[PDB]
Design an enzyme around this catalytic site. Sequence first.
Site, PDB file in Angstrom:
ATOM      1  N   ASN A   1       0.794  -1.226   0.000  1.00  0.00           N
ATOM      2  CA  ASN A   1       0.000   0.000   0.000  1.00  0.00           C
ATOM      3  C   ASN A   1       0.826   1.276   0.000  1.00  0.00           C
ATOM      4  OD1 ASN A   1      -2.583  -1.481   0.426  1.00  0.00           O
ATOM      5  ND2 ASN A   1      -1.689  -1.905   2.444  1.00  0.00           N
ATOM      6  N   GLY A   2       0.119   2.399  -0.078  1.00  0.00           N
ATOM      7  CA  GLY A   2       0.737   3.713  -0.049  1.00  0.00           C
ATOM      8  C   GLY A   2       1.909   3.981  -0.970  1.00  0.00           C
ATOM      9  N   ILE A   3       2.911   4.663  -0.431  1.00  0.00           N
ATOM     10  CA  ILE A   3       4.100   5.005  -1.193  1.00  0.00           C
ATOM     11  C   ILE A   3       4.757   3.745  -1.743  1.00  0.00           C
ATOM     12  CG2 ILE A   3       6.425   5.945  -1.032  1.00  0.00           C
ATOM     13  CD1 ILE A   3       5.443   8.064   0.793  1.00  0.00           C
TER      14      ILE A   3
ATOM     15  N   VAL B   1       9.524  -8.004   7.734  1.00  0.00           N
ATOM     16  CA  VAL B   1      10.863  -7.557   7.373  1.00  0.00           C
ATOM     17  C   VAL B   1      11.799  -7.238   8.530  1.00  0.00           C
ATOM     18  CG1 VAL B   1      10.130  -6.766   5.113  1.00  0.00           C
ATOM     19  CG2 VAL B   1      10.028  -5.196   7.058  1.00  0.00           C
TER      20      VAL B   1
ATOM     21  N   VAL C   1       3.135  12.068   6.600  1.00  0.00           N
ATOM     22  CA  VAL C   1       1.699  12.093   6.328  1.00  0.00           C
ATOM     23  C   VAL C   1       0.933  12.879   7.387  1.00  0.00           C
TER      24      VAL C   1
ATOM     25  N   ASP D   1       5.841  -7.850   2.429  1.00  0.00           N
ATOM     26  CA  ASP D   1       4.928  -7.109   3.286  1.00  0.00           C
ATOM     27  C   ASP D   1       4.159  -8.028   4.228  1.00  0.00           C
ATOM     28  OD1 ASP D   1       2.977  -4.143   2.435  1.00  0.00           O
ATOM     29  OD2 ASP D   1       3.389  -5.073   4.383  1.00  0.00           O
TER      30      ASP D   1
ATOM     31  N   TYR E   1      10.795   7.576  16.206  1.00  0.00           N
ATOM     32  CA  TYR E   1      10.690   7.651  14.749  1.00  0.00           C
ATOM     33  C   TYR E   1      11.839   8.428  14.110  1.00  0.00           C
ATOM     34  CZ  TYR E   1       8.766   8.511  10.084  1.00  0.00           C
ATOM     35  OH  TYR E   1       8.580   8.566   8.722  1.00  0.00           O
TER      36      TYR E   1
END
Lengths: 228, 228, 229, 229
Positions: C15-17, C61, C185, C36, C152
Amino acid sequence: QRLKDKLAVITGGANGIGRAIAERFAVEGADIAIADLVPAPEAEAAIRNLGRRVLTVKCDVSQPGDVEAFGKQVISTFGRCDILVNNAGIYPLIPFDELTFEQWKKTFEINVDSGFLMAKAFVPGMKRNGWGRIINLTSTTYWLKIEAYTHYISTKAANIGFTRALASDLGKDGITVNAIAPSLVMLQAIPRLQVPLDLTGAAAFLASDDASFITGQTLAVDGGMVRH
Amino acid sequence: QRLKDKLAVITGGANGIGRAIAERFAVEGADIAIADLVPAPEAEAAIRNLGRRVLTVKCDVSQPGDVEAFGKQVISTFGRCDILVNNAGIYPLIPFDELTFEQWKKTFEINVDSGFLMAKAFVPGMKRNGWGRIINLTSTTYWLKIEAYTHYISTKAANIGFTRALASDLGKDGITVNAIAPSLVMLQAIPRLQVPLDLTGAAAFLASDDASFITGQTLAVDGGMVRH
Amino acid sequence: QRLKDKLAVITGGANGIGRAIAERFAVEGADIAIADLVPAPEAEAAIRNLGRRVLTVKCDVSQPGDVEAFGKQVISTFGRCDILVNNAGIYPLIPFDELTFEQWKKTFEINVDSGFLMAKAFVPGMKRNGWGRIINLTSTTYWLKIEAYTHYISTKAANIGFTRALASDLGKDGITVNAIAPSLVNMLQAIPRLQVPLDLTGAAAFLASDDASFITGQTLAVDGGMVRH
Amino acid sequence: QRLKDKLAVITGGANGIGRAIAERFAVEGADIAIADLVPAPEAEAAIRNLGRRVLTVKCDVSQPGDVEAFGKQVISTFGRCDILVNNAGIYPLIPFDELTFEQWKKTFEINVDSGFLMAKAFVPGMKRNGWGRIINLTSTTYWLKIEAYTHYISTKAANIGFTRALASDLGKDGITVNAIAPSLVNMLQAIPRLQVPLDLTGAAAFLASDDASFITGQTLAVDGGMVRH
């Protein structure tokens, strides 16, 4: 052809990196307008051989008079400049104790004033059309310890400030302003000698719509020596 | 008294950050020489109150002639300048569409040529004595998205280029060259307005032996807004 | 088609980017391998529609066991990996006084270890073929004042150091390692509009092409001109 | 006596830069608390000789248990901690093709987790008193092309992210968070001579003093003018 129906201006485009970018843009569908002190017969023939239109003007990009005349001419011929590449610049090695105010001033006139003068001449046309690209050539020496370039590095840093500030000013008009920093011609990550062609891909990318959301940035293309 | 027995020159030192720095240096033991277009009565009183000597000279720091005269007067009066603080600078808000070549040039002459001219005048003395400190005032706007400052941010960037390059040229002469970046006067980590006194600690630090191995660097003092 | 005859791996590509980059890469002529936690039926359909080969594998991952198994499967299935996009990552907002060591550790395992584990799996093959491209996703929050992202931003900075150091290690092998920094985001950007996934794909394709063979160890910010570095 | 009556903690302060910072802080009037795997007799002697109090605790800064216990002991012993210098860290040279996940992980536990664990231990007190200084040691290799340090440079980059993000989290509490980047130890520097531990003490004392109350989230390189950022 990502630059189809676009008119690109390249200062100091008669030789070296300037010319390499000019031809790459032509290959991508753009017509060309070159401003330089010396004639650009080679660039002209190569560009026309690509089926592109090209105009070369003998001009001292540091002089307001020459830049204004160059601008009028380019506008009369192609009607508008969509892409402006400020590549013109000098880089003489000069020890500080020998550096005169005159040499210092001359360096700024050629390396910094030219980009400002060229922007004043073509930004209006870009704003009206709601789309534009300005690419300034700076140098990785900006991040390196190297002697006898106080005048040069000061101007190269100015080019980055110009890039960042002008980007802020023009971002709402569909115009991006970015800079490309080549090495001044082991310490690189990629053990390969830099050549003009190494910079054409970045220039083409930045001038395309694949980079419409990228502005005010400085992209170093030097085999991975500097990191910022 | 980290600056005991030293003469520090502060350009544009009559008011604001320049003044605060001049007084702090006095507190640290340095005699002061101020170059500015206006007299500095408040500054002189504070410095003399600290038992230090002070000399204020009416001077247009952008003019070679004035700087040369200023330099001869300082050397004649104090014999030498050990610390040079290039604080002088203008920052008018000017939208690109309104920005003329004359205003652009003027901004460079005041904000950038001054630092070069002053260095030319006082570096010889520092080199001869094997010790020196040059501190250039730049601006955090260099890393910020802000409009109407293309001329200003271009010079502020040049100031950093000048800092980095000159640092390389003089590193072996016992002279360090650094820059301080104050914010232009929610986005800050420290929720309070910046005051002149917030910058004096950094200046006194860079001007002392505590920073003899620090050169070519740019220190941001803005409450933690920019990060670089 | 600058990515013709290339096998590109995109972590967190369901999904997304991640998905957007994978699809653009397919458009450029490359086959795709997605790692994923969740299936990627939408991405697979779009990639197959472009006439490209695509493989999706359930994989955490952050787990060396998973990544290793994923690596073997990708190599067996396509023979090699030419492009590795380390996109996988999480970004929960957590005030410092509420941030636990467990949460902090978890953030690093997913955001940082994945990229390392994926590099250990595909770099050998790249080195052998004398050509490769590694692209790490970081964040502009790295240069911004913003609270509740100590974990983060710490991992996002690590992504950059990894990018720079690995670029040095592999510079002689024909492999480049760069990073892309999207915003996390209006008035703070030079370009007023909101950022969309398509804004990053052009940059990703460029870095993965021969147009950027002399570019390595760099971080490219794509955020409408907010940050400057 | 800019650090008069302050209690400063220096991890890895038994030798090198750590010790130099500890002694300088003592000179500036601060009492010292050292966390390290080895004893600091030389450090303790010099500090007591400066008329200051000192405590050295055998401690593995990568372990939560050790750090939590160290915090309680420091607070129990001095009743406060105003300054935290996260100096502890390792820098083994390891080619990428030889770097294992275990080595990678260990490097993060010591170089990065330690900083986090120490913050959780001392931040609460700093916030309660409304004054604090956290100084993280990073490295100029972050900006240099140099091989066999992918694990190391990734953690040093993490230190800068941590410094930036935590600065944002604690800015409203009278606490500043900054980083010092020494070179990893001639013509590459502007000032030719070799770097020595003392070269870093000035910057440490400056940042930890009230001469730097408005400075936070910054990284100061002290390397003789080699790197520029």
